[PDB]
């Protein structure tokens, strides 16, 4: 019957992430087991799996890293860590990943992405980009 | 004493729990958090004022029906008597009388609320 086949599919889900270590590393960390096809690995650790038999919010997904820029994201994960080459494919602006239709190379584009910095150091602080407009008079350093 | 013990155990659970709830956390008291809610704005009067109840007749007849329950409730013992006809007639009469009273109240619009 079909109950046995779904049990087989669940067995494959349980047994397609390495072992118990690799299974718990995904289950305690993403609360899902669904196996898909590895589209490509990023230059930080992200994995970017795919399974088009699901519906149009789950046909694509990510499994993040455990260290991006010395931050230990094994538990503290955030969506700011998807770089722009994969942001476009993950939010479904394309059917064309960067492993096949990559982007243009430019000298000024950042090589290493940066996640959101809001409370850390190396965050952003605003300031006047302009200069002194009304200059003062510096008096002389002699009397009379 | 078993039952007394079970109830004391539940009592002490509740009281220990409230003690924890009060003396474990932190407190920052001030008059603007300890005053009644009334949805962001302040109350226009006190809550210890008359709240007109519009089902008072229903309350009183609930009291009388509670007494009717108290009279009907001996039936499981009344059935092991030898007669089994006097109790039948008398229970019939009691229930029918209660139904008649309910019908009079219903028709006279006592179960309706005082608009």
């Amino acid at each position: 019957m079909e109950l046995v086949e779904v049990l087989k599919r669940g067995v494959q889900q349980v047994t397609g992430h390495g072992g118990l270590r690799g299974l718990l590393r995904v289950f305690f960390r993403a609360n899902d087991i669904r196996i898909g096809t590895l589209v490509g690995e990023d230059k930080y650790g992200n994995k970017y799996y795919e399974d088009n038999k699901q519906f149009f919010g789950r046909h694509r997904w990510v499994i993040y890293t455990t260290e991006m820029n010395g931050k230990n994201t094994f538990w503290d994960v955030d969506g700011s860590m998807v770089p722009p080459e994969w942001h476009r494919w993950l939010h479904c602006m394309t059917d064309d990943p960067p492993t096949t239709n990559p982007p243009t190379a430019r000298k000024f584009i950042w090589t290493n992405h940066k996640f959101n910095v809001s409370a850390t150091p190396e965050q952003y602080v605003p300031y006047s980009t302009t200069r002194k407009k009304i200059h003062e008079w510096v008096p002389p350093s002699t009397p009379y | 004493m078993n039952l007394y013990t079970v109830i004391f155990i539940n009592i002490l659970l509740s009281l220990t729990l409230i003690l924890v709830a009060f003396w474990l956390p932190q407190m920052n008291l001030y008059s603007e958090k300890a005053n009644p809610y009334e949805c962001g704005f302040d109350p226009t009067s006190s809550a210890r004022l008359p709240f007109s109840m519009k089902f008072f007749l229903v309350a009183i007849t609930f009291l009388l029906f509670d007494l009717e329950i108290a009279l009907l409730l001996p039936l499981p013992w009344a059935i092991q008597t030898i007669k089994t006809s006097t109790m039948m007639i008398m229970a019939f009469i009691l229930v029918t009388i209660l139904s008649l009273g309910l019908a009079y109240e219903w028709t006279q619009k006592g179960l309706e609320w005082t608009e």
């Binding site: 993403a30 955030d78 969506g79 722009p84 476009r88 939010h91 243009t104 584009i109 950042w110 602080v125 | -």
Partner: protein
Amino acid sequence: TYKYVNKKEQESEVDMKSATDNAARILMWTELIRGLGMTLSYLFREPATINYPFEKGPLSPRFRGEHALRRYPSGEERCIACKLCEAICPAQAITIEAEPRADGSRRTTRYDIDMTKCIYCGFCQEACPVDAIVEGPNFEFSTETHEELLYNKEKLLNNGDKWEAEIAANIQADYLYR
């Protein structure tokens, strides 16, 4: 044309069968078992939810989010301080203060955006004649400080140098419509 929603055509046809059916609707809650069955059907469907950080909502190239100041492929700064992105900004979010650059070029000494006044309308990027300021895809730039959401030229250029690989593609996809 019109039509009635709760107007009976005509009444006064009843027999013991219809009475039985109505009295069985009553006393069995038959029109409530249908609601129970509906909610039961919904228990056995695939839920519409998604594991957000790992799998996300579908967006389009037209999506307008965090801002950025772009550059040419030569790395030249693309804005020229024509000062109409702030003319049209219906929130008065943008400021510009411009000067010659010592190269002899119309460029900015200031490009601020109070992103607490921006309404994310797109008027600035559809007004810029050079495709300099855009409204990109990043919607995940929440902060713990008001002062962080007040941007300047350097932050916008950081955004551009960050998101060019996405913005170039979005523009390539959406032009021929704009």
